[PDB]
């Protein structure tokens, strides 16, 4: 294929040479007859003298050795100096390639090519499934979804991984291969557009490989942060935050923990009055004692306010936590000013209340906090608070690999510059490439143990049902963490032990065949096996 074009260029050079030697005049001395020695165009040369001509233009690496010259020695006989079998003999050391034609035996080359189609079709089938699932989520009824957003970004890293391998294999088939007797000799040389092209693809591959396990950590962290209770302590811990040191505020007081005022006059030493009473002697069990008492005092206040009591009674436990959130920030008299908004919540008119709450001056001051509280009244669940971590989840999936891969690209460019990076030095790929992946798996197993202990507590409580969406999503995430968390660790532990070779080529195609269908497995169990998407598929299809 690639050699067919070269053979056409060579035939063109041969035709072009035979015409250039035709027009020259016949020799009047006994000189080395002008000839095309299957490599270059040589004019008549006198005996006992070495000739030279510029490296032929048909070669792929023309511009790299165009300044260089090939040589051919003329002998005393009047005949050119020949090789061992009488073939033409020329010194083409200068015009030679920047690489080596690596031979591979008849059956061994047929084995590598046979296993090559298995991983080309494997990644193509996965890419086809990945892009099918991405089209279903990203252009249908789950458009502005919080759960499907994490899946789409997880598939996106696999699409790049599947894309990079298909490009690299497509650029590795641009090498020149020819059969030398039994062996198939493949040249290590690549074109200037292919050397740079596969180098970029190698960066995009390594960026994808790290991102896959980073977004696998996000999938694990999603269940851990979603499924944990969810309590008012986590709700206000996102809105205000935990703190051990006392800091000033808009009224001029000593604010500590999650929204607590210690002393009524501006002072530092007198703030230990109410702190020692709660402690009885600041940590996470000590500081939460101040927080728990605050929430109880907020509920006390809501029930002692005539305007706030009936609204608080009518609303459910999750919606109550949204009102306590407001009273925490504003106060009893401040939240009681929402006479029109509160009325709409007592009537159970959520979307009508969502418009009137945003129109008030509370949303004007702090829009980020109020938007999450308004959503809690709207849907009646903690949907807004699981999305607060999404910005941080985005920085851990795309930002975290760039902390390791972008500095590695610059290291491999100047230190060990190779054609298509897949070296076995164990210096750059272990600390720069494997470390961010091995640390993700380390944190994933620490999450996995926390997921099971959170599952057993929930499976015996009031939210114990098996047909729940949180139970369904766990069946996928608890499978992809141990399957991927073992596949890449078992491969890296035993890969420097074998030479090339006999047991290595069988071991490589064992793991690479699973790695090719890795993207298909992720797509199937998260999108295609998903019941919620299957219901909307039947809804969208049965309409016609």
């Amino acid at each position, epitope marked *: 294929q690639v*050699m067919d074009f*070269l*053979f056409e260029k*060579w035939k063109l050079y041969g035709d072009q040479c035979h015409h250039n030697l035709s027009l020259l005049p016949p020799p009047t001395e006994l000189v080395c007859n002008r*000839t095309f020695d*299957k*490599y270059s165009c040589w004019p008549d040369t006198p005996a006992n003298t070495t000739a030279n001509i510029s490296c032929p233009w*048909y*070669l*792929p690496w023309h511009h790299k050795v165009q300044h260089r010259f090939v040589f051919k020695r003329c002998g005393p006989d009047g005949q050119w100096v*020949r*090789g*061992p*079998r*009488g*073939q*033409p003999w*020329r010194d*083409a050391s200068q015009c*030679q*390639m920047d690489g080596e*034609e690596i031979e591979v035996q008849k059956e061994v080359a047929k084995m590598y090519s046979s296993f090559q189609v298995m991983y080309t079709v494997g990644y193509s089938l996965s890419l086809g499934a990945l892009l099918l699932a991405l089209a279903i989520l990203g252009g249908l009824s789950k458009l502005h979804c919080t759960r499907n957003a994490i899946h789409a970004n997880l598939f996106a890293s696999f699409v790049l991984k599947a894309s990079s391998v298909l490009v690299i294999d497509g650029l590795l088939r641009t090498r*020149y291969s*020819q*059969k*030398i*007797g*039994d062996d198939l*000799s493949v*040249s290590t040389w690549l074109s200037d557009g292919a050397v740079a092209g596969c180098r970029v693809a190698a960066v995009f591959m390594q960026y994808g490989i790290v991102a896959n396990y980073c977004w696998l950590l996000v999938e694990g962290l999603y269940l851990h942060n979603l499924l944990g209770l969810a309590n008012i302590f986590e709700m206000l811990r996102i809105d205000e935050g935990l703190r051990l040191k006392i800091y000033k505020d808009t009224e001029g007081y000593y604010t500590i923990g999650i929204g607590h005022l210690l002393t009524k006059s501006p002072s530092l030493n007198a703030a230990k009055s109410e702190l020692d009473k709660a402690i009885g002697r600041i940590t996470k069990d000590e500081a939460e004692k101040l927080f728990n008492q605050d929430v109880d005092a907020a509920v006390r206040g809501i029930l002692r306010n005539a305007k706030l009591k009936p609204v608080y009674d009518s609303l459910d436990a999750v919606r109550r936590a949204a009102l306590i959130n407001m009273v925490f920030q504003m106060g009893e008299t401040g939240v009681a000013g929402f006479t029109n908004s509160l009325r709409m919540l007592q009537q159970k008119r959520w979307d009508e209340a969502a418009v009137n709450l945003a129109k008030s001056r509370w949303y004007n001051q702090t829009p980020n906090r109020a938007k999450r509280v308004i959503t809690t009244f709207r849907t009646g669940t903690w949907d807004a608070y699981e999305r607060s971590f999404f910005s941080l989840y985005l920085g851990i999936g795309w930002g975290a690999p760039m902390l390791f891969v972008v500095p590695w690209a610059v290291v491999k460019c100047l230190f060990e510059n190779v054609q298509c990076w897949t070296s076995n030095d164990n210096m750059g790929f272990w600390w720069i490439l494997r470390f961010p992946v091995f640390l993700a798996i380390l944190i994933n197993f620490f999450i996995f143990v926390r997921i099971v202990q959170l599952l057993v507590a929930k499976l015996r409580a009031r939210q114990m049902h098996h047909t729940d969406y949180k139970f369904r999503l766990a069946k996928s995430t608890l499978t992809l963490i141990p399957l991927l968390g073992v596949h890449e660790v078992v491969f890296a532990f035993v890969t420097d032990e074998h030479a090339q070779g006999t047991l290595r080529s069988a071991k490589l195609f064992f793991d690479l065949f699973l790695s090719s269908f890795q993207g298909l497995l992720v797509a199937v169990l998260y999108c295609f096996l998903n019941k919620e998407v299957q219901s909307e598929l039947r809804r969208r299809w049965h309409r016609w």
Partner: antibody
Framework: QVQLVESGGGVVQPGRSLRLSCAASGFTFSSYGMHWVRQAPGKGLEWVAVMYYDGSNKDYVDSVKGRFTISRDNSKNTLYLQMNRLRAEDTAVYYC?????????????????????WGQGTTVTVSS | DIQMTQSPSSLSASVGDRVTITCRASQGIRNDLGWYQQKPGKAPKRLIYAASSLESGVPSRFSGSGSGTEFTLTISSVQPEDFVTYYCLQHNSNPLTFGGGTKVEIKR
């Protein structure tokens, strides 16, 4: 169907000439280099000439140099050997054989793979 | 010119024996060696090429080995048909040179 069938050899007189013929079938004659090999009645095998498609590359054994002349017609798929100034030492059975060669366009080196397919042998008796 | 010293000139072996013919090249000729078999009246047929590689359709008993200067043809278990002449052939440098020719005769 890959074969080579010699012909032409017979009884000749010393000094006179004789043109041996070797007719290829079953393969692309233009690809393969070709050889001539003789064997004396009581002695072992002796190489004598070679040629390639060019056919600027020809070679012979010191004893037959100038005397013997190898040639080919790729259209007729035939190898030849014009044997002039014949001597008693030439009395032999003459085999022809093909050699596959490969030229690496990238490096400019030739790789040779020996005499694979042989003929059956045409006897040449040179006597008065 | 490469003198192909073939040894022995005529070995005596009986059916079943392992026969070992050796050809020694005067210069370094790489793996460029071919072992041939000539039956009485028939043309010479190559059994081994590239010094060690076996020709397609040749009984597995025949085997080649060696490189450069020492080369060996080995018939693990001679059968009735194997009792004929064998030659080595160098194709590394012109002029091409054969061996003297080992004749495998049936011992008694």
């Amino acid at each position: 169907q890959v074969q080579l069938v010699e012909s032409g050899g017979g009884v000749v007189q010393p000094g006179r000439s004789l043109r041996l013929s070797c007719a290829a079938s079953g393969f692309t004659f233009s690809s393969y280099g070709m050889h001539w090999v003789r064997q004396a009645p009581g002695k072992g095998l002796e190489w004598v000439a070679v040629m390639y498609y060019d056919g600027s590359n020809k070679d012979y054994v010191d004893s037959v140099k100038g005397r013997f002349t190898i040639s080919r017609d790729n259209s007729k798929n035939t190898l030849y050997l014009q044997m002039n100034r014949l001597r008693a030492e030439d009395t032999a059975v003459y085999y022809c054989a093909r050699e596959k060669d490969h030229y690496d366009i990238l490096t400019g080196y030739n790789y040779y793979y020996g005499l694979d397919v042989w003929g059956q042998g045409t006897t040449v008796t040179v006597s008065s | 010119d490469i003198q192909m010293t073939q040894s022995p000139s005529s070995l005596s072996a009986s059916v079943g024996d392992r026969v070992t013919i050796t050809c020694r090249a005067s210069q370094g000729i790489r793996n460029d060696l071919g072992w041939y078999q000539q039956k009485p009246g028939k043309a010479p047929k190559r059994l081994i090429y590239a010094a060690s590689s076996l020709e397609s359709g040749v009984p597995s008993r025949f085997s080649g080995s060696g490189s450069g200067t020492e080369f060996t043809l080995t018939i693990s278990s001679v059968q009735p048909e194997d009792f004929v002449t064998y030659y080595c052939l160098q194709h590394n440098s012109n002029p091409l040179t054969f061996g003297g020719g080992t004749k495998v005769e049936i011992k008694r």
